[PDB]
Amino acid sequence: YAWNRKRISNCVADYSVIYNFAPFFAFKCYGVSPTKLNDLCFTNVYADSF
Amino acid sequence: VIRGNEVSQIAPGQTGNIADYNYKLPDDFTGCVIAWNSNKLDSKPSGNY
Amino acid sequence: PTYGVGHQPYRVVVLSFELLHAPATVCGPKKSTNLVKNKCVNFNFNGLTG
Ligand SMILES: *[C@@H]1O[C@H](CO)[C@@H](O)[C@H](O)[C@H]1NC(C)=O
């Protein structure tokens, strides 16, 4: 009910360290694919943790 | 033998670490992939190297 | 063994069948039948029906 939102901006994002940081199975995306996240890029990224 | 994060990487049309440098499958691949956990046999308390 | 479920070792066996172009060598368990001719029959030649 009090989920924390973190704004990510003004940096270079590498998504290959997400597997090193946390022990999960599926990097379940909806509008994109996991293997193509390092090529194209966005405006802002938000992280919501609960 | 691979890690648990990269079991889904053994598929036609994948990129990254295993699929680009170690084991690549063709785009028109026909066949089956069988994967199961082997933490009992392929792991050690000191670290399996 | 103290790692998470995403960092466990996994054994992977990949079976790679190739479709039939040469005469077939490996085939599943099925009983063969005598060959009949000049009759409207259903046939099964090396897995393809008709
Ligand atoms: C998380 O951070 C703590 C403190 O910096 C560190 O001891 C720990 O190893 C980190 N976890 C991972 C998986 O790197």
Curated annotation (Swiss-Prot), chain B:
Record protein name field: Spike protein S1
Record region (Integrin-binding motif): 3-5
Functional description taken from the UniProt entry: Attaches the virion to the cell membrane by interacting with host receptor, initiating the infection. The major receptor is host ACE2. When S2/S2' has been cleaved, binding to the receptor triggers direct fusion at the cell membrane. When S2/S2' has not been cleaved, binding to the receptor results in internalization of the virus by endocytosis using host TFRC and GRM2 and leading to fusion of the virion membrane with the host endosomal membrane. Alternatively, may use NRP1/NRP2 and integrin as entry receptors.
Domain of life: Viruses
The organism of origin for this protein: Severe acute respiratory syndrome coronavirus 2 (2019-nCoV)
Full-protein positions shown: 401 to 449 of 1273
Subunit record text: Binds to host ACE2. RBD also interacts with the N-linked glycan on 'Asn-90' of ACE2. Cleavage of S generates a polybasic C-terminal sequence on S1 that binds to host Neuropilin-1 (NRP1) and Neuropilin-2 (NRP2) receptors. Interacts with host integrin alpha-5/beta-1 (ITGA5:ITGB1) and with ACE2 in complex with integrin alpha-5/beta-1 (ITGA5:ITGB1). May interact via cytoplasmic c-terminus with M protein. May interact (via N-terminus) with host bilirubin and biliverdin, thereby preventing antibody binding to the SARS-CoV-2 spike NTD via an allosteric mechanism.
